[PDB]
């Protein structure tokens, strides 16, 4: 199984009442481990997963340093952005940033990432090859030409193919217990009778990790999508995930319906029916 | 491991 690490920054200008609020968070796959809040009392990179506490003071110092520095870098880009886009200084604006790497089952560098978004719109992004850039508009075309002549890509390529993977690897092993585990979905199904000759069969999937899961509603040996009500996967808050898809079903035809649950933590895809 | 990000737009 391929694993991934992502850090996610979020700078928000609050004109005339302080420097922007900067909130960065890091995940390995679907599990988060660190965070940083420009406003929280720590003024340090705080752990979130049990296993990252394992890291020594050197790690925390350097990590704190890097992210604080990033916070400045973007606080200034928030200004640079305004000029490039001829926007007012009294408006509140949002500069989200994302960087990370992927590792294969082997632990080999799979793919790196680095991209910025001003007020929730692709601004600049490092291409798949970590050698050139893709700029959104005439605004980023400036930042692009700047970063081209500074060989910034090279700098980033070095981080992505180096520090980034090295850390992702260390973490997966450090917290092997937690991160490589695959909590299977504890699936059941309940009856919700509605009006006349009609009912609701809610297919439940609870306490599974990771969040990648696919629910199928098949009746009579035939897949059904029209009466399916599948909510976007949701967290449990305990480090697991949840999802349900209901179908409106005629009175007495309940035993003719089956639910197909595919997940990484299962030996084989599950099949569920109305069990009175 | 966080990134060494220091460049300006």
């Amino acid at each position: 199984g391929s694993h991934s690490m992502r850090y996610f920054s979020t700078s928000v200008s609050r004109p005339g009442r302080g420097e922007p609020r900067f909130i960065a968070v890091g995940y390995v796959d679907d599990t988060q481990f660190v965070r940083f809040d420009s406003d929280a009392a720590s003024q340090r990179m705080e752990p979130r997963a049990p296993w990252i506490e394992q890291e020594g003071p050197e790690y925390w110092d350097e990590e704190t340093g890097k992210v604080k520095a990033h916070s400045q870098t973007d606080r200034e880009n928030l200004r640079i952005a305004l000029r490039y886009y001829n926007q007012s200084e009294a408006g509140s604006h949002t500069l989200q940033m994302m960087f990370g790497c992927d590792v294969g089952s082997d632990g080999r560098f799979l793919r790196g990432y680095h991209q910025y978004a001003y007020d929730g719109k692709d601004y600049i992004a490092l291409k798949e090859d970590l050698r050139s850039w893709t700029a959104a508009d005439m605004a980023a075309q400036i930042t692009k030409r700047k970063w081209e002549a500074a060989h910034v890509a090279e700098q980033q390529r070095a981080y992505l193919e180096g520090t980034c993977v090295d850390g992702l690897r260390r973490y997966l092993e450090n917290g092997k217990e937690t991160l490589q585990r695959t909590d299977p979905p504890k699936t059941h199904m309940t009856h919700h009778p509605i009006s006349d000759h009609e009912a609701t069969l809610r297919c439940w999937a609870l306490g599974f990790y990771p969040a990648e899961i696919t629910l199928t509603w098949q009746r009579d040996g035939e897949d059904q999508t029209q009466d399916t009500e599948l909510v976007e996967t949701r967290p449990a808050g305990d480090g697991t995930f949840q999802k349900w898809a209901a179908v409106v079903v005629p009175s007495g035809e309940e035993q003719r319906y089956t639910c197909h649950v595919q997940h990484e933590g299962l030996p084989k895809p599950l099949t569920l029916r109305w069990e009175p | 491991n966080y990134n060494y990000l220091y460049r300006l737009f």
Epitope: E62, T64, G65, K66, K68, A69, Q72, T73, E76, H151, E154, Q155, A158, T163 | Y4, Y6, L8
Partner: T-cell receptor, first 115, second 113 residues
Framework: SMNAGVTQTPKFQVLKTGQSMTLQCAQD?????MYWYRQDPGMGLRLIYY???????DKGEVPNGYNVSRLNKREFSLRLESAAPSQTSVYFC???????????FGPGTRLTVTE | MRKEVEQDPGPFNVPEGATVAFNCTYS??????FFWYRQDCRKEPKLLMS???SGNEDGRFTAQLNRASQYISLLIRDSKLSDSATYLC?????????????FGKGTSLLVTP
């Protein structure tokens, strides 16, 4: 390039160990980050203070006996409140677009403190 | 003395027209940028050129970075009395909070006719 962007003043100074004194620095290049270094033979450049943005300042490798003030986007002052033989060095100031960017240096200032 | 940038100092007498190669070794693996600086005796440091992995040619001057082995090289062909001066290895890297420039004590060249 005459790098006349960065300007230090004075080029030479001499002091009674008691005396106070302030060196001045200015960059016309519209950089954000300015730095006050101190080149002593057999140790090379060592940073005293710096100023990453227009508003803020921070201590460097050897900020003792020294104090700075980034009065403005262009100007960054180094101030010796009470000179000491110890503080006899060459002092260089420099600016760069932002932190970690190639630094452009002033001509530097030769200061000597005598009992 | 403890130095993240180490540069063999000592005058390096070399004849004019001769090739000179200089090297510099940086400790901190998290170094992000790399530069060569030429400083004339009794004068200020001037950026000579930034050194990149892809390689950096500039006529007489040529410089490479080895991230792997953590060294940078500057090589000057057809050396000239004019380029007699002290060469400073400069690398940026995260000091405290804020990326900052570390300067080598510098190696001093003396081209002679």
């Amino acid at each position: 390039s005459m790098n006349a962007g960065v300007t230090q003043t004075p080029k030479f100074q001499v002091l009674k160990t008691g005396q106070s004194m302030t060196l001045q620095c200015a960059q016309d290049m519209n950089h954000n980050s300015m730095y006050w270094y101190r080149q002593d033979p057999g140790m090379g450049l060592r940073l005293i203070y710096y100023s990453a943005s227009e508003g803020t300042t921070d201590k460097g490798e050897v900020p003792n006996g020294y104090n700075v003030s980034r009065l403005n986007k262009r100007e960054f002052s180094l101030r010796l409140e009470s000179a000491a033989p110890s503080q006899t060095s060459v002092y260089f100031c420099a600016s760069s677009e932002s932190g970690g960017y190639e630094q452009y240096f002033g001509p530097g200032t030769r200061l000597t403190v005598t009992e | 003395m403890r130095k993240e940038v180490e540069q063999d100092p000592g005058p390096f007498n070399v004849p004019e027209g001769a090739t000179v190669a200089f090297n510099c070794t940086y400790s901190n693996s998290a170094s992000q940028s790399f530069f060569w600086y030429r400083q004339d005796c009794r004068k200020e440091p001037k950026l000579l050129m930034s050194v990149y992995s892809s390689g950096n040619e500039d006529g007489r001057f040529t410089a490479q970075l080895n991230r792997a082995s953590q060294y940078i090289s500057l090589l000057i062909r057809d050396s000239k009395l004019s380029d007699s001066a002290t060469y400073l290895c400069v690398v940026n890297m995260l000091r405290n909070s804020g990326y900052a420039l570390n300067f080598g004590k510098g190696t001093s060249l003396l081209v002679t006719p």
